Amino acid sequence: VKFPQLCKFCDVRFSTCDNQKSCMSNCSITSICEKPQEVCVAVWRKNDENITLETVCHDPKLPYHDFILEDAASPKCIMKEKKKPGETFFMCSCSSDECNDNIIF
Amino acid sequence: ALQCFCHLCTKDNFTCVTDGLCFVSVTETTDKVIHNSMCIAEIDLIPRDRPFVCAPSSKTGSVTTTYCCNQDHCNKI
Amino acid sequence: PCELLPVGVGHPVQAMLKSFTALSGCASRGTTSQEVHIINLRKGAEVALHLRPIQSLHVHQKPLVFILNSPQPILWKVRTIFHVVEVHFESGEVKVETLPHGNEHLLNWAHHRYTAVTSFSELRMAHDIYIKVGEDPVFCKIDNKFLSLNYLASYIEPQPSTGCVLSGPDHEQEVHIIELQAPNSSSAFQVDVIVDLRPLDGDIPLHRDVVLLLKGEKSVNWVIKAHKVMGKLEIMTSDTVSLSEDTERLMQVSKTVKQKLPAGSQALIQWAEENGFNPVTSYTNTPVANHFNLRLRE
Amino acid sequence: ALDTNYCFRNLEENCCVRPLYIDFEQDLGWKWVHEPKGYYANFCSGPCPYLRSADTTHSTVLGLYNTLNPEASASPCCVPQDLEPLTILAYVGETPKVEQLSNMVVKSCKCS
Amino acid sequence: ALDTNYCFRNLEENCCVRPLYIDFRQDLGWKWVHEPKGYYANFCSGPCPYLRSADTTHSTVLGLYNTLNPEASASPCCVPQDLEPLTILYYVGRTPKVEQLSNMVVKSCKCS
C-alpha cells in the first residue's frame, strides 16, 4: 500500500539562503501529502536582491512552474538550475519523508 | 472484509478478518529471525492517512522491514 | 419511585436464581473391587444427565451402574447399565424395576446386586444432573451435609423483583437498567451473574442496539450471553464484565470503565439520561438473584 | 491472541500465558475451600516488545518509546486479557455452598 | 484510587502512576505531529503487594500467592486503569487537522 509522504509544506517563504552548498528550508510545517502519488518539491528563486524558497507536496505526473519533474525518485533534494527570465531559478524534488527540508546545491 | 495472516491465531488456521490493514514485520536479531504478522483495525491506524505503525520503522541496529497491504493474505513477505 | 412497584409478566427482565442442590450422599473408591452411581430423585417428565470425569485418560471404559429412582415416570436424557423405575442417548441397558424410595434402603438395594457404591446422590428435582466418572482414592456413609462438585443438580428458581417499563420499543436504542443487590446467599467475593439476551419470540434473529446499565451493591462479575441478537451492545457498570465468544462475534461490544454509578431508580434513570441513553426502556431492581433473562421487543 | 493455545505450544520468551497450579491450602493456606484442593490459575509473564498485543494506544507508544529508550524502565507489562471462572465448594457453617468464582483462571495475556 | 493526585504528591515505592514526558520527534521519531511537540504520557511502575488496588480475583490470588511464595516471581503488575485522550494537530496538505487521540495519558494504575 502506497502511503502519502511527509513533506515540508510552507508554500512560498522568504529565505536568507544563498552562497551555500547545503541549506535548511526552515519550514515549520511537515505535512502529509493529500494524495499518495505526490512527492516533495523545493524551488529556489533569487529575483533581484530578494531570495525566496517554496516547499510543497506535488504530483510528479504534472508540471510545476511549467517544468517536468525529472528527479521525482531521488532520496535527497538536489537543486537543478532552470532558466527563467531575469531571475535565478532552482528546483528539486524527492521521494523521502521531509526530504525537501535539507536542500543541496 | 480483509483476510490477513496472523501468527497468533492458532484457532483459525492462523488468520484474522480485519477492517483496516494487514501487517507484517521482520526483525533481524543476530541469533534468530522474527516474523510478526497480524491484523490492524481501522481505529488503530493513526493517522489514517499515514498510519505510523506502517510508517518506515527501520532504526539503528535492527534491520526491521514493516509492510502494510490490503489484499487478502498479502502479508506473506 | 420506580424501584418499589412490583413487576408482572410483561417485563423484559426476569430474575432467576441458578443453584446446585443435593440433599445427601456418600463417596467411595469401589473400582478397587463397574462403578455404581445412585440418584435418589424426589418430588418438586424429563431429566438430563451429564457424565464427565476429571479426564485423566479421557476415555471411560468401565461400564457404569446408574440407579435412577424417582416418585415420577421420568425420561432420562443422557448427554455425552441404567436401573430405572425411558432413557435416550442423542451400549445402554434399560431395566425397569421397583426401587425403594427411602435413601437407606435404596443404598443397600445397590449393595445387593453390586459390591460397593461409588457415589450416592439424593436430589430434589432438577432437569439437569451433572455426575462423576472418575474415582478419588481418598475415600459409603450417606450424610445430610455432604456435597461433592462431581455430583450436582441444577435448578433455576425465579426471583421477585420490582421496577417499571418507561419507554416502549418505538426507539432506536433499547436501553435497560438492572440494579442487583445480592447475587448469592453466601457472600465471599466476586461471583458470576449471567445476563441472557434473546429476542422475545425466539424464531428470527434481531438487529438491535442494546444499552445495559448493570449496578449491584455486592461486587459481581457480569457475563453477557447474547443469543440471536446482533448489533451495538453498550455495557455500563460499576463492576467488571465478561463476554461469551458468541457475544463479541454477534455484536459490537462497547466497554464500561467501572463507573461510580448512583443508587436508586430515579438516580440511575437520571444518570442514563444525562449520558446519551434516551429514553430508558426498563428499570429492574432485584433483591437477590444471579441470572437475568432479558427479552427484547421489536 | 496470546492465549493458552498459542502460549503453551510455543517457546516464547516474551509476554505469554504461563502455567501455574495453586493448591489452596499449601500455597495460600485456604482451608475454607473444600472442593477442589487446587486449580490451574496461570499467570502472565515476559517482556512486552513493540506492537506485541498492545492493549491501548498508550501501550503502543510506550512500547515504541521503550524500544528507542530501553533504560527508561517505562514499558508495557504483560497482563491477563481474558479470564475464566472457577466453580468451588465451600462450607458456610455446616451448609455446603456451590459458588462459581468469576475471573479466577487466566486464559490470555495482553501488553498494557 | 492510585491516581495522579495521590501518586504524584505522596511518594510510593509500590504500584503508582509515574510522570513521563514523551517528545514526539526525539523520543518516537514522529515528524508528522505538528502541535504539540510532546505530551506527558505518564506510566505505571512499582511492585504490587497483596490487596493493593487488585483488578480482579486472579490478581488477589496472585498477589497473595506471591506474598507467601515470593521466589515464584509470578505477581500482579502495575498497569493503567483509567487513561485519557490527547488532542493533537497535524497537516494533510494545507489543512490543519485537530484529532483527539484516545487512550494516550494514563491517570491511574491498578494491579493486574
Numbering used by the authors:
A (entry chain D): 45 to 149
B (entry chain C): 31 to 107
C (entry chain E): 30 to 62, 65 to 75, 85 to 120, 130 to 134, 138 to 142, 149 to 197, 201 to 359
D (entry chain B), E (entry chain A): 301 to 412
Manuscript text:
Betaglycan (BG) is a transmembrane co-receptor of the transforming growth factor-β (TGF-β) family of signaling ligands. It functions by enabling binding of the three TGF-β isoforms to their signaling receptors and is additionally required for inhibin A (InhA) activity. BG is nonetheless essential in vivo, where it binds and potentiates the activity of the three TGF-β isoforms (TGF-β1, -β2 and -β3) by presenting them to their signaling receptors, TGF-β receptor type I (TGFBR1) and TGF-β receptor type II (TGFBR2)4. BG, and a homologous co-receptor of the TGF-β family known as endoglin (ENG) which potentiates the function of BMP9 and BMP10, are transmembrane proteins with a large (approximately 760 amino acids) extracellular region comprised of two domains: the membrane-distal orphan domain and the juxtamembrane zona pellucida (ZP) domain19,20.
Additionally, in a separate approach we wanted to obtain the structure of the TGF-β:BGO complex bound to both of the signaling receptors, TGFBR1 and TGFBR2. As the TGF-β1:(TGFBR2):(TGFBR1)2 heterotetrameric assembly cannot recruit BGO, we aimed to construct a variant with the signaling receptors bound to only one monomer of TGF-β. We therefore switched to the TGF-β3 heterodimer, TGF-β3WD, a mutated form that indeed can bind only one pair of TGFBR2:TGFBR1. We successfully assembled the TGFβ3WD:zfBGO:TGFBR2:TGFBR1 complex and in this case we used the more flexible TGF-β3, expecting that the bound TGFBR1, which spans the TGF-β dimer interface, would lock TGF-β3 in the closed conformation. Thus, we returned to crystallography and successfully obtained orthorhombic crystals of the TGF-β3WD:zfBGO:TGFBR2:TGFBR1 complex and determined the structure at a resolution of 3.0 Å. However, our structural data demonstrates a completely distinct interface, with the zfBGO subdomains, OD1 and OD2, and the paired antiparallel β strands that tether them together, forming an arc that straddles the edge of the TGF-β fingers. The positioning of zfBGO on TGF-β is responsible for the 1:1 stoichiometry as a significant clash between OD1 from both protomers would occur with a 2:1 stoichiometry. The most extensive and crucial interface for TGF-β binding is formed by the loop from residues 244–251 located between the β2 and β3 strands of OD1 with the sequence PNSSSAFQ (highlighted in orange in Fig. 4a I). Inspection of the TGF-β:BGO:(TGFBR2)2 and the TGF-β3WD:zfBGO:TGFBR2:TGFBR1 structures shows that the BL of BGO partially occupies the TGFBR1 interface formed by the heel helix of the adjacent TGF-β monomer and TGFBR2, which would be expected to block binding of TGFBR1. However, the binding affinity of TGFBR1 to the TGF-β:TGFBR2 binary complex (KD ca. 30 nM)41 is significantly higher than BGO binding to TGF-β (KD ca. 200 nM), enabling TGFBR1 to outcompete and displace BGO.
